[PDB]
Amino acid sequence: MKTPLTEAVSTADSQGRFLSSTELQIAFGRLRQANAGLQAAKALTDNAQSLVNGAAQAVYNKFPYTTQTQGNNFAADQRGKDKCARDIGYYLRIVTYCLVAGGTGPLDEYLIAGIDEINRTFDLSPSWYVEALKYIKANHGLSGDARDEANSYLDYAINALS
Amino acid sequence: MKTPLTEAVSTADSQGRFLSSTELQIAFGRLRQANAGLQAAKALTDNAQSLVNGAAQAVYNKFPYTTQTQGNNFAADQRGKDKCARDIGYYLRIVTYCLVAGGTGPLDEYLIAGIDEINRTFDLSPSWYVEALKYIKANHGLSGDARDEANSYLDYAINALS
Amino acid sequence: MKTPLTEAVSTADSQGRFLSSTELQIAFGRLRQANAGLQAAKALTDNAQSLVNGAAQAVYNKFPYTTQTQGNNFAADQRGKDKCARDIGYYLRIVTYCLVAGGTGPLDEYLIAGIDEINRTFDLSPSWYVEALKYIKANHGLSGDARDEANSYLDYAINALS
Amino acid sequence: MKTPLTEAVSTADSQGRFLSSTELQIAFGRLRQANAGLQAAKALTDNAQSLVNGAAQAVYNKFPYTTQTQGNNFAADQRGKDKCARDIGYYLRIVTYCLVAGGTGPLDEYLIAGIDEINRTFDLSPSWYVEALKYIKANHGLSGDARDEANSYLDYAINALS
Amino acid sequence: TLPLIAYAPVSQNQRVTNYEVSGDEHARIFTTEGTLSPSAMDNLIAAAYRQVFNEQQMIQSNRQIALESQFKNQQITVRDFIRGLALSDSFRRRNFEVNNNYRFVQMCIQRLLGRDVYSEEEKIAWSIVIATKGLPGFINELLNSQEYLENFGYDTVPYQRRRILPQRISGELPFARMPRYGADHREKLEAIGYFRN
Amino acid sequence: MFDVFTRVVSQADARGEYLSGSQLDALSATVAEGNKRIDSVNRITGNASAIVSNAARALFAEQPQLIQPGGNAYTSRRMAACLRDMEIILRYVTYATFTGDASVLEDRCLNGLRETYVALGVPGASVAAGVQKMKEAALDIVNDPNGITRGDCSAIVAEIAGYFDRAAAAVA
Amino acid sequence: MFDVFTRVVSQADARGEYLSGSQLDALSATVAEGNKRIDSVNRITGNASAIVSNAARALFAEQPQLIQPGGNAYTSRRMAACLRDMEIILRYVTYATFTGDASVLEDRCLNGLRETYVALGVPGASVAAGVQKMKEAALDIVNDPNGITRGDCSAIVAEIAGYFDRAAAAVA
Amino acid sequence: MFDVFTRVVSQADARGEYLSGSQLDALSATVAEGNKRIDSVNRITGNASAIVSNAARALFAEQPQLIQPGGNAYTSRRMAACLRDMEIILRYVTYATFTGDASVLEDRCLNGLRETYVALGVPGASVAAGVQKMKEAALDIVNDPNGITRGDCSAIVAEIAGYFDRAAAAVA
Amino acid sequence: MFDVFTRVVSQADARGEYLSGSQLDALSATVAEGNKRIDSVNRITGNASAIVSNAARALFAEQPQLIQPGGNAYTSRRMAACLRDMEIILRYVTYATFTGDASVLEDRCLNGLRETYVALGVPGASVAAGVQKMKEAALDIVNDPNGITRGDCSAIVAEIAGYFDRAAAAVA
Ligand SMILES: *[C@H](C)[C@H]1/C(=C/c2[nH]c(/C=C3N=C(/C=C4\NC(=O)C(CC)=C4C)C(C)=C\3CCC(=O)O)c(CCC(=O)O)c2C)NC(=O)[C@@H]1C
Ligand SMILES: *[C@H](C)[C@H]1/C(=C/c2[nH]c(/C=C3N=C(/C=C4\NC(=O)C(CC)=C4C)C(C)=C\3CCC(=O)O)c(CCC(=O)O)c2C)NC(=O)[C@@H]1C
Ligand SMILES: *[C@H](C)[C@H]1/C(=C/c2[nH]c(/C=C3N=C(/C=C4\NC(=O)C(CC)=C4C)C(C)=C\3CCC(=O)O)c(CCC(=O)O)c2C)NC(=O)[C@@H]1C
Ligand SMILES: CCC1=C(C)/C(=C/C2=NC(=C\c3[nH]c(/C=C4\NC(=O)[C@H](C)[C@H]4CC)c(C)c3CCC(=O)O)/C(CCC(=O)O)=C2C)NC1=O
Ligand SMILES: CCC1=C(C)/C(=C/C2=NC(=C\c3[nH]c(/C=C4\NC(=O)[C@H](C)[C@H]4CC)c(C)c3CCC(=O)O)/C(CCC(=O)O)=C2C)NC1=O
Ligand SMILES: CCC1=C(C)/C(=C/C2=NC(=C\c3[nH]c(/C=C4\NC(=O)[C@H](C)[C@H]4CC)c(C)c3CCC(=O)O)/C(CCC(=O)O)=C2C)NC1=O
Ligand SMILES: CCC1=C(C)/C(=C/C2=NC(=C\c3[nH]c(/C=C4\NC(=O)[C@H](C)[C@H]4CC)c(C)c3CCC(=O)O)/C(CCC(=O)O)=C2C)NC1=O
Ligand SMILES: CCC1=C(C)/C(=C/C2=NC(=C\c3[nH]c(/C=C4\NC(=O)[C@H](C)[C@H]4CC)c(C)c3CCC(=O)O)/C(CCC(=O)O)=C2C)NC1=O
Ligand SMILES: CCC1=C(C)/C(=C/C2=NC(=C\c3[nH]c(/C=C4\NC(=O)[C@H](C)[C@H]4CC)c(C)c3CCC(=O)O)/C(CCC(=O)O)=C2C)NC1=O
Ligand SMILES: CCC1=C(C)/C(=C/C2=NC(=C\c3[nH]c(/C=C4\NC(=O)[C@H](C)[C@H]4CC)c(C)c3CCC(=O)O)/C(CCC(=O)O)=C2C)NC1=O
Ligand SMILES: CCC1=C(C)/C(=C/C2=NC(=C\c3[nH]c(/C=C4\NC(=O)[C@H](C)[C@H]4CC)c(C)c3CCC(=O)O)/C(CCC(=O)O)=C2C)NC1=O
């Protein structure tokens, strides 16, 4: 699970040595990014309901056939809309967990690994979730180091889906 | 050699993946230590001749038998003192290399790996080099982040020799 | 432990075959050397206390700084002299064990394994034990096949330390 | 091949070590019984023609169906008798090679490896060759050191054929 | 596919640094990096057979004749010969078909990586590698594993690693002891009608 | 394997000398440029899939010989290998941009790449054209003013272009 | 494995909810603790060989029966193995101090150590006493007030001591 | 593994003392009957195939359910494995005879063989009976007065009998 | 590999002929020289570390351009590898002296060693010079009359010199 501290300890254990100043610099970079990551996680946490509702609305605007055509994979009925909102909430929550963790590790362990089999099996287009993550990129309202750290996780999930 | 940038790129290559926010934070910690490492290497470069001569002399005060007992591994002659001053210059120069690079990778590839064969084969005691690096620890003349980074390289060579 | 007999078996075991006449000739050489090894070990057991005291005194003669400089690793006080006498006692006892066994196996599994990190984390010079083994090689008084096969273990431990 | 010198060197090479007193005793037993092996090999070389003819006659006496039934694998014609004499000469010459060499290595490289596929392909019964080797055991005429060294290779080929 | 589920390492002797001289109870390196006699190549092939198939399946029907011939010509490395022994029909029928995925993972980790499994969790983690990628995918994962390499590389027959510590008459149990099948296939052979009196 | 500091360390140790003041000041200027270097790495990493897909589409629009049957990029196995090679070359260009030195690129990607492509019959000029399309996309994405604080980034972008040119020259 | 951040992340995923404000404030307190944590890691790493050597010397002074013949620290192989065990346990204590959570210490060091020491005949009480001697050695190195910025470091010292007792209880 | 020398060396190093005169005289006695030891090893090695074949034949004569259809030795493959087990047990008895110590026999042959034969369904009583039949065959072959220098050899015969009984007791 | 006996055995098998009386007499002379051969092996083995240390010291004294920085024996890793290479080449010379044939030296040491040194940039002329220094050290130690029974040993010395010349010719 990728985190600067866990990967530094994994590297030092794989070479079987103590934590030299290289891993100290890794921890310093984690510690420097940590306040912006926690502030970004708090902002996404208390704006998450509006972000998820707007992201579902943006996906339904770009892909109206999800709301019109029948099917278990589509949001034409109520349960499809609830499952789409819960999936977008899962994406945003794992992005906040990546912001707290300071790496893409929550995305790898929780969402990125095996998402191709889920999209293949239940016939979900990854472009829907890509458009949802683009909505999260466009309207999360952050600036500076908090925006660049949060958009990196959103682009990492976009890169994994596209 | 082992630097934060090399460890980050080698890790991202080890899982075969792009440089996530973890490796970016590794680079930020490298950047925030790199300036203080650069003036630390500059100050050690300017004080190199005095520090090497003083460290060799401190070895001769703590270990006078090196200047008295005749032998190839001892500094009784001018050849032995030249070899000792060359060795301490090598140690201090690789310490400056570690300060420039930002990790003990110059120490690993140039000095730490294989030094056990060096001290067993040519009958050099590691305690002499431990005392000399303790002298470099004593009056290198750095403060703050430059002092903590440079002494971590001096302790890394001391712990490998002990 | 490394010994003609054990080594012969190990070879026949790794090839999964019975003990051929090669193995029997290995046993024959073990048999013709074993009586000389046993008499050599008997003579060294008889001369053990004088050889240990003389070897410790020879190490103190060539390295007088061990008897005048304070420290844990030195023999300036009574505890250091006791640890040194125990060290040459261990050396001579494992040499007698190698004589009895007929191979370097007691040295390999009792003393040579891990002597380097012992000598560097307790700050012990291997040259002290080398000079002790030179005294044992000079004052053991054996002749003939007992002399050469005892000296092969003494130079084996000398080449291991140096 | 498998001789004490070659096996000692291969063992010491695999364990990455110099030739200790164990390998010296291996060569000592090799020297102790090498003279007896050489003069046994000379006695077998001088008596080889009578030994091969008597062994062929003993096989034809124990197994008369080889000299009366038609077939490529049988010695009914003169060609089959020449093939059987050539085979027993091969066996005896490799026995002399093993006596010279000091181990079953000439047997393992020249006779043992691949004799089962020959015996099952060309329809040759290994019991014929076992009886020939038993005649070579009963009529080599060696005594003492030569007899036990020769019959080791005779029995090694017997147990490989049985 | 999917990433292997994480399993914690359990302390085994191969994990720590070996402070030993090789000596008596070292496993002999069967390597092709030095130029060998055909006899020494035959003992190396027999050592690979003894490691993969154990002593019992060293029979002529279980000898891979073309694989041996290609290995003599250095068409393949020692690691590829070990793979061909693991991909052999005899190995698959005798060892893989008579075991579940868990015990076969334990067998292959012992006979290829030279170490025991850490726990049941490692057997669980590599058993789904078996179940999705087949036996060839699993063997390939084990033979491309850094462990296999840093220990044996490309040109060394694998061996049990650190079975016995210096100056110890006894250590860990040898890998030869493990049977083709466990007690489940034993009682299944007993239930089908074998082994009774 | 070297980065922008480790290359200077290796050169100075091969000369057996301490780093001069000019080398220390050059590395200090590199540390000053490091934030823009991290921005360039982050932008190419965040738009890597877009770069690879658009560069592949432009390459196979310019070179339809590859996707027609009987072509190298034809069939899903060979096209999957082609897109994997596109993202691998982009990944090691980002690694070289991160380190500030091309040792990772010429040692861990381009090592034996041309021999592999010639032995496979892979058109190395076609891979070079795709690398140039990735270069154009990456220097478009990095030089985008919007969403980032302004500044002069000529040197890091020229370094990225040099990485892409030595990636294209190692397969041509 | 987990650190102080990813443990709380994993527990929040187990509850399946966003991190509340109190958890983020506690993690910001860990951020404020992080510089002192890095200082403690650096001090134990820099004095690791002295800590291992002095703890071994004081352990074999308090327990002379280990270095006597018939003992477990007897002979050079077992002595080097004992010193390696001290260095390994100290190394994973520094790993757990660096992370802020003892997942690496339980999973990668202390998993199966007790029955390993049972099977080899290693006395786990003496190893626990050696880990204790390492604990006061590392706490004397960390809490040295010379050559460092003044401040309160009771939480990181208590965390190091708890990691050391967690290492010592896994062998006794 | 140990031999007759390295075993006594191992208790001497456990006690931390030099060998006494009586221990060296006992080892000189083992050197004295070392020639009869090498004769015993040579005779069992020379007649190993005959011992394995004759003892397996007699064992399946007295225990026909092993060769009956369904038996544990009921195939060409299982009979080959059973004969290989005989060869292996005989090989390790000769290894113990060569060393003068059953440390190699207890280490690489006997420890865990009972659980192996239980997990296979191999009848360990039948393997013990076959190992016993190998004991009378090997002891009749060793005690052959023909073609050897005459002398007392009851010690090495009793040592081989003890190794065979220890091999039979490990599987029964 | 081959030794002095199996070389003649392989030549006789390639001829398909029994060994002639000249070959038996030559091998009996080899058996007579075998004690001097074992003395030479024992002396070089017992002074191997002194030979490697003194030969390296004299080599990097008369060729100091390799331990100066930028040289091939510069740095601890490189110098440890150079000392290890000297120890390995000396070890295989002892192996070839032990066997009485240079098969093990040529096939497991000298095969590909020139190729390895030119691939790594190791100057093979300097390694050949160091092999000549180990040659002069080993032939001085072997020909020492002290502590050994006096006798003619010039054939063994010339054979060791031949193995050292083979080692020197195969690195450059
Ligand atoms: C000085 C503190 C004491 C001293 C030193 C002494 N050293 C040597 C010989 C060598 N030192 C090294 C060390 C290095 N070589 C490297 O490449 C590096 C990394 C850049 C290091 C640290 C080596 C390799 C040698 C041997 C090869 C050589 O001679 O260059 C000697 C000479 C030993 C000899 O036998 O010729 C001496 C005397 N001696 C003292 O008394 C001081 C207390
Ligand atoms: C018999 C008609 C002739 C003959 C044959 C001979 N062949 C070899 C050795 C090898 N033969 C091969 C060929 C193959 N191995 C394969 O796997 C395949 C396809 C699957 C083929 C075609 C190989 C690879 C070898 C070398 C490896 C090995 O030895 O097995 C020998 C041995 C030569 C030697 O001295 O080593 C011989 C004698 N010899 C004849 O005289 C007949 C004309
Ligand atoms: C004597 C020549 C010089 C000397 C010696 C000295 N040695 C030690 C400590 C140790 N020595 C050993 C060595 C062995 N232990 C073994 O089990 C074996 C194999 C049987 C050997 C060779 C070990 C393990 C130690 C440390 C553990 C212990 O104290 O027993 C010391 C003490 C070091 C300390 O810090 O306490 C000393 C002083 N010192 C001299 O000045 C002589 C020139
Ligand atoms: C990476 C996590 C990890 C650890 C730490 C570990 C410990 C470990 N300690 C061992 C032995 C040992 N451990 C000790 C330790 C001690 N003896 C004493 O008397 C003292 C109380 C104590 C030190 C304070 C000794 C002496 C041995 C030698 C075992 C022997 O050879 O008999 C062994 C047997 C393997 C070998 O020695 O090569 C292991 C695996 N294994 C793992 O996977
Ligand atoms: C022989 C094995 C093989 C397969 C299967 C294959 C598929 C394949 N289809 C592609 C594109 C495409 N496929 C479509 C297909 C469709 N768009 C739609 O709206 C329809 C609903 C649908 C048809 C069912 C489109 C529009 C593209 C172009 C994508 C682009 O240029 O971005 C591409 C991209 C490269 C290119 O432009 O040629 C490949 C490789 N290629 C192969 O070599
Ligand atoms: C160490 C870093 C690394 C490199 C450098 C690498 C390159 C690489 N590219 C390959 C194949 C390939 N590469 C391509 C690429 C292309 N075909 C085209 O027509 C285009 C011009 C181009 C993409 C723009 C194709 C089509 C193959 C498969 C060839 C085949 O299957 O015959 C292969 C063969 C093995 C495989 O398919 O996985 C390798 C090793 N793999 C690595 O791990
Ligand atoms: C972990 C994710 C993360 C990243 C990657 C990051 C990068 C980063 N880039 C910065 C600056 C910058 N970035 C640029 C880059 C550019 N300016 C341009 O107009 C060009 C389009 C472009 C080149 C690609 C410049 C010019 C600066 C200001 C100068 C400097 O700080 O070096 C800064 C300084 C703070 C700021 O002013 O924003 C940071 C922290 N911070 C984070 O938290
Ligand atoms: C790469 C090597 C490296 C390290 C490790 C490092 C650590 C480091 N520790 C710091 C602070 C500090 N370190 C401590 C630690 C302590 N104070 C005490 O009196 C206790 C004895 C002790 C606990 C072990 C405190 C209290 C601060 C100031 C508060 C803080 O910055 O968090 C600072 C802030 C700058 C300063 O004021 O010095 C740095 C950079 N800097 C580097 O370049
Ligand atoms: C080196 C010490 C050692 C030994 C000796 C050992 C014995 C051993 N005997 C086996 C099988 C066997 N063992 C036997 C033996 C018999 N069957 C009978 O009915 C008779 C009572 C007896 C003949 C005396 C048989 C028949 C098998 C075949 C079981 C099978 O494959 O189904 C197996 C499993 C075969 C395999 O994995 O391929 C082992 C490991 N394991 C070890 O580590
Ligand atoms: C390389 C092949 C080889 C071998 C194996 C060998 C063995 C060997 N056995 C010997 C003696 C002997 N062997 C025996 C053995 C026995 N006496 C009996 O009546 C029992 C039936 C039997 C126990 C199995 C005895 C009693 C001696 C004489 C005492 C002794 O030398 O130890 C001797 C002394 C020389 C002699 O008198 O013959 C040798 C060399 N020599 C060789 O060249
Ligand atoms: C296991 C350890 C061991 C070894 C190595 C050993 C060797 C050994 N070398 C011998 C002889 C000898 N060694 C030499 C060797 C030499 N003479 C010289 O003046 C040259 C300086 C030198 C060549 C290096 C000679 C000439 C003989 C007597 C001739 C002979 O026995 O072959 C002898 C015959 C007994 C004797 O007279 O001493 C033995 C046993 N014995 C042992 O127990």
How many whole angstroms separate alpha carbon H80 and alpha carbon F66? 58
Q: Which residues of F touch I70 (CB under 8 A)?
A: 13-16
Half-sphere exposure of residue I133: CA atoms within 13 angstroms, side-chain side:
23
| Of residues C118, C150, C138, the one with CA closest to residue C59 | C138
Task: Tell me if A153 sits within 8 A of B21, measured CB to CB.
Answer: yes
Q: For residue B72, which phi and psi values (nearest 5 degrees)?
A: -70, -35
CA of I37 to the centre of ligand 11 (A): 8
Residues in a beta bridge with E31: E156
Chains that touch D (3 or more CB pairs under 8 A): C, E, H, I
How many whole angstroms separate alpha carbon A79 and alpha carbon A87? 12
* F111-139 exposure pattern, b = at least 16 Cβ within 10 A, e = fewer: eebbeebeeeebbbebbbbbbbbbbbbbb
* A40 to A4, A31, D109, E109: CA distances (angstroms): 18, 15, 74, 45
Task: Record the tokens describing residue B152, joined without a space.
Answer: 């971590």
What range does the domain containing H65 cover?
A: 1-172
Task: Record the tokens describing residue G128, joined without a space.
Answer: 């626990």
* Other Cβ atoms within 10 Å of B84 Cβ, number: 24
Q: Which of E21, E35, E37 to mutate to test the interface with D (most CBs of D within 10 A)?
A: E37
Task: Record the tokens describing residue D73, joined without a space.
Answer: 């694998």
Three-state secondary structure along I12-79?
A: HHHHCCCCCHHHHHHHHHHHHHHHHHHHHHHHHHHCHHHHHHHHHHHHHHHCCCCCCCCCCCCCHHHH
Helical packing angle, D21-46 and I21-46, nearest 10°: 180
DSSP F20: P
How many whole angstroms separate alpha carbon I43 and alpha carbon A42? 76
Q: For residue B20, which phi and psi values (nearest 5 degrees)?
A: -80, -170
Ligand 6 atom at shortest distance from the alpha carbon of F113: 5
* Other Cβ atoms within 10 Å of H60 Cβ, number: 19
User: Which residues make Cβ contacts (< 8 Å) with residue C96, sequence separation at least 6?
Assistant: C41, C44, C45, C48, H18, H19
Q: Which residues of D touch H48 (CB under 8 A)?
A: 159
User: Which residues make Cβ contacts (< 8 Å) with residue F58, sequence separation at least 6?
Assistant: F133
How many whole angstroms separate alpha carbon A114 and alpha carbon A124? 13
Handedness of CA C37, C40, C46, C48 (dihedral sign): negative
Backbone φ/ψ region at A63: left (φ over 0), alpha (ψ -120 to 50), beta: beta
How many whole angstroms separate alpha carbon G130 and alpha carbon C52? 32
How many whole angstroms separate alpha carbon A88 and alpha carbon A56? 7
How many whole angstroms separate alpha carbon I109 and alpha carbon E34? 7
Chains D and I touch (3+ CB pairs under 8 A): yes
How many whole angstroms separate alpha carbon G82 and alpha carbon I68? 39
Tell me the binding residues of C for (2R,3E)-phycocyanobilin. 84
Chains that touch I (3 or more CB pairs under 8 A): B, C, D, E, F
C156 inside 8 A of chain I by CB: yes
Count contacts between G and H (CB, < 8 Å): 11
Half-sphere exposure of residue A156: CA atoms within 13 angstroms, side-chain side:
28
Q: What distance in Å separates residue G69's CA from the closest CA in chain A?
A: 31
Task: Tell me if A48 sits within 8 A of A92, measured CB to CB.
Answer: yes
Determination technique for this entry = cryo-EM
Instruction: Give the DSSP H or E segment for C154.
Output: helix C145-161
**Exposed/middle/buried for I17, CB within 10 Å: 0-12, 13-18, 19+?**
exposed
> Which amino acid appears at position A6 of this protein?
T
How many whole angstroms separate alpha carbon B158 and alpha carbon B142? 19
Alpha helices per DSSP H over chain H: 4-15, 21-32, 34-46, 48-62, 76-99, 103-105, 113-120, 124-142, 154-171
I144 inside 8 A of chain E by CB: no
Handedness of CA E87, E92, E94, E95 (dihedral sign): positive
* G121-153 exposure pattern, b = at least 16 Cβ within 10 A, e = fewer: ebbbebbbbbbbbbbebbbebbeeeeebeeeeb
How many whole angstroms separate alpha carbon C81 and alpha carbon C83? 5
How many whole angstroms separate alpha carbon A77 and alpha carbon A70? 8
Smallest CA separation from ligand 9 atom 29, residue:
H78
Three-state secondary structure along chain E?
A: CCCCCCCCCCCCCCCCCCCCCCCCCCCCCCECCCCCCHHHHHHHHHHHHHHHCCCCCCCHHHCCHHHHHHHHCCCCCHHHHHHHHHCCHHHHHHHHCCCCHHHHHHHHHHHHHCCCCCCHHHHHHHHHHHHHHHHHHHHHHHHHCHHHHHHHCCCECCCCCCCCCCCCCCCCCCHHHCCCCCHHHHHHHHHHCCCCC
| Of residues D27, I149, D31, the one with CA closest to residue C143 | I149
Q: Could you write out the DSSP letters of every residue in C4-15?
A: HHHHHHHHHHHT
Residues in a beta bridge with E156: E31
SS3 of H73, please? coil
DSSP B113: T
Look up the CATH number of the domain holding residue F53. 1.10.490.20
Task: Record the tokens describing residue E143, joined without a space.
Answer: 């033979």
Task: Tell me if D152 sits within 8 A of C24, measured CB to CB.
Answer: yes
Q: For residue F55, which phi and psi values (nearest 5 degrees)?
A: -70, -40
How many whole angstroms separate alpha carbon C71 and alpha carbon H57? 73
Helical packing angle, H21-32 and C21-46, nearest 10°: 160
Task: Tell me if C114 sits within 8 A of G76, measured CB to CB.
Answer: yes
Task: Tell me if C77 sits within 8 A of C83, measured CB to CB.
Answer: no
Q: For residue C71, which phi and psi values (nearest 5 degrees)?
A: 160, 160
- How many residues comprise chain H? 172
Pocket around ligand 10 at a 6 A CB cut-off: C 21, 24-25; D 33, 36, 144-145, 148-149, 152; H 35-36, 38-40, 42-43, 142-145, 148-151, 153
Task: Tell me if E98 sits within 8 A of E181, measured CB to CB.
Answer: yes
What homologous superfamily does CATH list for D1-162?
Phycocyanins (1.10.490.20)
* Other Cβ atoms within 10 Å of F67 Cβ, number: 18
Q: Please state the domain count of chain H.
A: 1
Task: Record the tokens describing residue G118, joined without a space.
Answer: 């049972």
State the distance between the two ends of chain A, measured CA to CA, in whole angstroms.
22
Task: Record the tokens describing residue F124, joined without a space.
Answer: 């190395």
Handedness of CA A115, A121, A125, A131 (dihedral sign): negative
**Exposed/middle/buried for C39, CB within 10 Å: 0-12, 13-18, 19+?**
middle
Q: What distance in Å separates residue I69's CA from the closest CA in chain F?
A: 5
* Other Cβ atoms within 10 Å of D73 Cβ, number: 15
How many whole angstroms separate alpha carbon B117 and alpha carbon C161? 10
Handedness of CA E31, E36, E40, E41 (dihedral sign): positive
User: Which residues make Cβ contacts (< 8 Å) with residue B51, sequence separation at least 6?
Assistant: B44, B92, B135, B136, B139, B140
Task: Record the tokens describing residue E72, joined without a space.
Answer: 């003599």
| Of residues A105, A134, A130, A104, the one with CA closest to residue A119 | A130
Alpha helices per DSSP H over D63-114: 78-101, 105-107
Ligand 2 atom at shortest distance from the alpha carbon of E67: 17
Helical packing angle, B78-101 and B145-161, nearest 10°: 130
User: Which residues make Cβ contacts (< 8 Å) with residue E171, sequence separation at least 6?
Assistant: E13, E25, E162, E163, E164, E165, H107
How many whole angstroms separate alpha carbon I143 and alpha carbon H52? 53
Handedness of CA C95, C101, C105, C111 (dihedral sign): negative
Q: Could you write out the DSSP letters of every residue in chain A?
A: ---HHHHHHHHHHHTT----HHHHHHHHHHHHHHHHHHHHHHHHHHHHHHHHHHHHHHHHHH-THHHHS-STTS-SSHHHHHHHHHHHHHHHHHHHHHHHHTSSHHIIIIIITTHHHHHHHTT--HHHHHHHHHHHHHSS---THHHHHHHHHHHHHHHHH-
* Other Cβ atoms within 10 Å of D65 Cβ, number: 12
Task: Record the tokens describing residue A94, joined without a space.
Answer: 């794992």
**Exposed/middle/buried for D129, CB within 10 Å: 0-12, 13-18, 19+?**
buried
In testing the pocket of ligand 9, which one of H83, H89, H120 has its CB within 8 Å of the most ligand atoms? Answer: H120
DSSP D110: I
* H117-153 exposure pattern, b = at least 16 Cβ within 10 A, e = fewer: bebbbbbbebbbbbbbbbbebbbebbeeeeebeeeeb
How many whole angstroms separate alpha carbon F120 and alpha carbon F111? 15
- How many residues comprise chain B? 162
In testing the pocket of ligand 8, which one of G28, G30, G31, G36 has its CB within 8 Å of the most ligand atoms? Answer: G36
Backbone φ/ψ region at E118: left (φ over 0), alpha (ψ -120 to 50), beta: alpha
* A80 to A73, D124, I134: CA distances (angstroms): 7, 79, 82
B23 inside 8 A of chain F by CB: yes
